[PDB]
Design a protein around this ligand. Structure first.
Ligand SMILES: Nc1nc2c(ncn2[C@@H]2O[C@H](COP(=O)(O)OP(=O)(O)OP(=O)(O)O)[C@@H](O)[C@H]2O)c(=O)[nH]1
Ligand SMILES: Nc1nc2c(ncn2[C@@H]2O[C@H](COP(=O)(O)OP(=O)(O)O)[C@@H](O)[C@H]2O)c(=O)[nH]1
Ligand SMILES: Nc1nc2c(ncn2[C@@H]2O[C@H](COP(=O)(O)OP(=O)(O)O)[C@@H](O)[C@H]2O)c(=O)[nH]1
Ligand SMILES: [Mg+2]
Lengths: 445, 451, 111
């Protein structure tokens, strides 16, 4: 009745998609054959939101799969749920970006994007009630980053008022997964910020910490992480896909989460997270959900929210709650922690509560938070970029793909402006812009 | 005859309308697929409730209801729920995109794409009212469609039907509980637009009803199904005089003529009683005095301001079931005699009283109190000026910084619209202050003797 | 009110010697007050020498049942004073007290 399209871009953007789509096949009853075999009439009622109804109890996902290497594409299709992705919804190169954000954006990924856009059009002209687009991706990568951004900027040219949601991995804190991360992430931002409505900043070392801390596993791999994340992208879209006491459309959270037009980078979170040897012990309650989601060290993001103030926060519940307790735990956590909140945005919360829980489990909630603490990540990446750029480090490779020195300088300037702004939203007072004045005379002539 | 028509506007209006329209069937014997299970006059008779239903076929009932949110997810729950085969299929109305908790999406874009389909089906219901009274809208002030569509419906109705009773029934802003970051804006762009239209508007808050459920009913877990299934009894107690016989019945006009000294001062705050747990109902005495005491108790009010912070102007205190006019006169004379329960200096006459013979009847599916008699109260008072002062506080911190305003801009709205709504709140603040004052006379300035 | 005046006439051509008019109504009511004082002030122009007599519920001193009582009562009395012949004042605060004191009725009903 309303319909979503999704983009799986680059290695990471697609590896997350393959486990996201596993989670979202199971939620709608759907076997890896690409047919239903499910357990509710309500799984089918809204099977349309993700999927196209193909003939004779057949579903295919509204997924379009984008890369310049074929490698993970071979691994999706020889992988679990492979048979479900229709062949024409794979659209890829055989030459790569080779981590170069610019070789995505300007050289090779640009030579593919129109042929992508066909597959995007085939899908968009067939869901009349088209509501928005999604992407998953790397921010520091060459491909999900360098091509998925131009693709987003050409999606936003064709679908101008529809929602744009963006599910980034970010660069790594202490050491890098790819050396050019500070330039990939900063080039990426100056395409994103004028073309997305929602951006989600996931930190893989926060998922590695969350895995050893709250799930208490020493050996978490991509499958554990690609499931830990998929509750956010499942979560955020549950109150669309199933009934609730507060149903919520995608725009219904963006319009609560974003107070100014570039202020739309988020810290995600989830509850509950508990190890296999302690799920027997921690309580299945709405104060445990709320205080698990607002735990500073429960954030799936590079930053400690006690370093900032929350502009806005949404909180999506799942399962069968007292609405009184949903409200009373938001009331409490804001009374207990008021000084981590932008005080001229009084009452900083958006709730949504879906009646339908995660598989075979009593309850959950999904956090999407707007702290200013997010400025620490873009501070890092601007100070890092500065140290590569005032030396021409790696810069031959990207200017070698035709980028002018003004392109990196506008980008850095653009990031710096976003960072300067974030300071101007942080700890701010309800001030009204007046200046010092003094008395006249009453001795009239 | 005496027909009313309800419009259930947005997710709250809709969630409420599912509670209400269980009980409007259940009071008459009417089943969840519109059937009268036994009828002493097939094709006439009593059937006093053609005021709430149009008859078809062999005595099947069609209700006089409308459902609208631009979300299928909340309307399809009507068309696939327990009552799907009651309502009329072109009275479960949708739109192509839900309103994001925003005004302008309603009033200037997407509500403005559905308003003429809605006004047309309303015209077909209205022409089939032989004695159209008017219409009620059920909403939240904090809602998206709640704000954005009510406003655009009552800009249409009030010059389509005019002198016909224009009513609202509104979820009214909680003091400390909130749902959405954008509620203060949704409320205040609707008061600007729609307070020029309603003749009376009736008010409740979830933060008080959660209190009622946790205290009075002694429920540990208020779901919205627990909450709204109380509210049913508010409009069941308002609407009784049109549905059953009695001794002193009150039309939908008379609330207006009695609750409203001034045609901006028409927002009276509800309460309803008795409300007890299934333990308490066996130790209470529940006589008309003791109900009427609990009806003026500050904790017991269905909008969460203490009426003692205000002063009372007017009031309407209708009684239903086992009730006696002398016994009622006695409880009025008691609350009146306690002048400490505070009216304005100028008040000559502050009351509106009613007697309906049919009792209170609950729902299936609770541990509930099957009481013999009830009251349903509405208070007009300056105490609402405490929660206006809160909207005056919330608004100015956001709007100065110009937080969120670009979401309203980009879906059809003037900047001057926010400004001129808060201008109206700057008036309303004072419209309520020029009443709370004592009637004493005089003007200008003097510093000397007359004597 | 013309459609009534027509029935009042059809009744008056049934009366061999028309005595006049009794009314029961309320002064604190709407219709009893407003449409009755319409009818009272129109009869008198049509029935000049007949008596026109009234048994009114009147506002009581301690409580009130309707907020516009003083307006309705005072707008009423304006017409009644110069278009009627008797005004029997009936008051529920006394009726309720007679039922309670003199008849020892613990719970006086409108019956
Ligand atoms: N009493 C009560 N209030 C409700 C209920 N559902 C939600 N609310 C309230 O109503 C408002 C939420 O409704 P919205 O989500 O804005 O629904 P809408 O009006 O359709 O707006 P869109 O869905 O964006 O069109 C908030 O102010 C809530 O506190 C309900 O069933 N009962
Ligand atoms: N969370 C998670 N991160 C991964 C996964 N695979 C790769 N990444 C991360 O993504 C980044 C690599 O970017 P990549 O997607 O290879 O670049 P691209 O393909 O050129 O866009 C590094 O930070 C990797 O740790 C995955 O499935 N899960
Ligand atoms: N004594 C008496 N007064 C009544 C009775 N029922 C209604 N009233 C009174 O009449 C007033 C009600 O006005 P109403 O008749 O409803 O207005 P109308 O229909 O517009 O004329 C209130 O003062 C009531 O107390 C009754 O049977 N006996
Ligand atoms: Mg809606």
């Amino acid at each position: 009745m309303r319909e979503i399209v999704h983009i799986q871009a680059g290695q990471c953007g697609n590896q997350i998609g393959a486990k996201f789509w596993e989670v979202i096949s199971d939620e709608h009853g759907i076997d890896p054959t690409g047919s239903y075999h499910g357990d509710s009439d309500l799984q089918l009622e809204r099977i349309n939101v993700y999927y196209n109804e193909a003939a004779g109890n057949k579903y295919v996902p509204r997924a379009i799969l984008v890369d310049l290497e074929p490698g993970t594409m071979d691994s999706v299709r020889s992988g679990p749920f492979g048979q479900i992705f229709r062949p024409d919804n794979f659209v890829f190169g055989q030459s790569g970006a080779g981590n170069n954000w610019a070789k995505g954006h300007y050289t090779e990924g640009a030579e593919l994007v129109d042929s992508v856009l066909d597959v995007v059009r085939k899908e968009s002209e067939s869901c009349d009630c088209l509501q928005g687009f999604q992407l998953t991706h790397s921010l520091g990568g060459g491909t999900g980053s360098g091509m998925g951004t131009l693709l987003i900027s050409k999606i936003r040219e064709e679908y101008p008022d529809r929602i744009m949601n963006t599910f980034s991995v970010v660069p790594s804190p202490k050491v890098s997964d790819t050396v050019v991360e500070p330039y990939n992430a900063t080039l990426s931002v100056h395409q994103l910020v004028e073309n997305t409505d929602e951006t989600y900043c996931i930190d893989n070392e926060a998922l590695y910490d969350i895995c050893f801390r709250t799930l208490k596993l020493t050996t978490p791999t991509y499958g554990d992480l690609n499931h830990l994340v998929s509750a956010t992208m499942s979560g955020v879209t549950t109150c669309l896909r199933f009934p609730g006491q507060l149903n919520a459309d995608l725009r219904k959270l963006a319009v609560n989460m974003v107070p100014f037009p570039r202020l739309h980078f988020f810290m995600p979170g989830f509850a509950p997270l508990t190890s296999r040897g302690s799920q027997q012990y921690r309580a299945l309650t709405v104060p445990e959900l709320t205080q698990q989601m607002f735990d500073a060290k429960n954030m799936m993001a590079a930053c400690d929210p006690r370093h900032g103030r929350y502009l806005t926060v949404a909180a999506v519940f799942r399962g069968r709650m007292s609405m009184k307790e949903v409200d009373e735990q938001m009331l409490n956590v804001q009374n207990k922690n008021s000084s981590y909140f932008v005080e001229w945005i009084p009452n900083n919360v958006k709730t949504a509560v879906c009646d339908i829980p995660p598989r075979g489990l009593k309850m959950s909630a999904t956090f999407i938070g707007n702290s200013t603490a997010i400025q620490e990540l873009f501070k890092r990446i601007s100070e890092q970029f500065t140290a590569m750029f005032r030396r021409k480090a790696f810069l031959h490779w990207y200017t070698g793909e035709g980028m002018d020195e003004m392109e990196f300088t506008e980008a850095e300037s653009n990031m710096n402006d976003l960072v300067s702004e974030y300071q101007q939203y942080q700890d701010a007072t309800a001030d009204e812009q007046g200046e010092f004045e003094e008395e006249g005379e009453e001795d009239e002539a | 005859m005496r027909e009313c028509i309800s419009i259930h506007v947005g997710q709250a209006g809709v969630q409420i309308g599912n509670a209400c329209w269980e009980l409007y069937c259940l009071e008459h014997g009417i089943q969840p697929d519109g059937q009268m299970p036994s009828d002493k006059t097939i094709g006439g008779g009593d059937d006093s409730f053609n005021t709430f239903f149009s008859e078809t076929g062999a005595g099947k009932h069609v209700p006089r209801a409308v459902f609208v949110d631009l979300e299928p997810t909340v309307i399809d729950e009507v068309r696939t729920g327990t009552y799907r085969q009651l309502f009329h299929p072109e009275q479960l109305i949708t739109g192509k995109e839900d309103a994001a908790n925003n005004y302008a999406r309603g009033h200037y874009t997407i509500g403005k794409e559905i308003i003429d389909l809605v006004l047309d089906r309303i015209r077909k219901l209205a022409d089939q009212c032989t004695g159209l009274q008017g219409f009620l809208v059920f909403h939240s002030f904090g809602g998206g469609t709640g704000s954005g569509f009510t406003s655009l419906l009552m800009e249409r109705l009030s010059v389509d039907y005019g002198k016909k009773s224009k009513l609202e029934f509104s979820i009214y802003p909680a003091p400390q509980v909130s749902t959405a970051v954008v509620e203060p804006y949704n409320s205040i762009l609707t008061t600007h637009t729609t307070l020029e239209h309603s003749d009376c508007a009736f008010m409740v808050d979830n933060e008080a009803i959660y209190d009622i459920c946790r205290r009075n009913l002694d429920i540990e877990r208020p779901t919205y199904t627990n909450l709204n299934r109380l509210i049913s009894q508010i409009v069941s107690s308002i609407t009784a005089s049109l549905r059953f016989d009695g001794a002193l019945n009150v039309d939908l006009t008379e609330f207006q003529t009695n609750l409203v000294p001034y045609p901006r001062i028409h927002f009276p705050l509800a309460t309803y009683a008795p409300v007890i747990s299934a333990e308490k109902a066996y130790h209470e005495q529940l006589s008309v005095a003791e109900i009427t005491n609990a009806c003026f108790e500050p904790a017991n009010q269905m909008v969460k301001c203490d009426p003692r912070h205000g002063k009372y102007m007017a009031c309407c205190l209708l009684y239903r079931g086992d009730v006696v006019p002398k016994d009622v006169n006695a409880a009025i004379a008691t609350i009146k005699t306690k002048r400490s329960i505070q009216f304005v200096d100028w008040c000559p006459t502050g009351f509106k009283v009613g007697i309906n013979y049919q009792p209170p009847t609950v729902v299936p599916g609770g541990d509930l109190a099957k009481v013999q008699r009830a009251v349903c109260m509405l208070s007009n008072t300056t105490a609402i000026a405490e929660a206006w002062a809160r909207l005056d506080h919330k608004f100015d911190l956001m709007y100065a910084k110009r937080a969120f305003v670009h979401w309203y801009v980009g879906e059809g709205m003037e900047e001057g619209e926010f400004s001129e709504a808060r201008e109206d709140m700057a008036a309303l603040e004072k419209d309520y202050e020029e009443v709370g004052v004592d009637s004493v006379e005089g003007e200008g300035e003097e510093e000397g003797e007359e004597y």
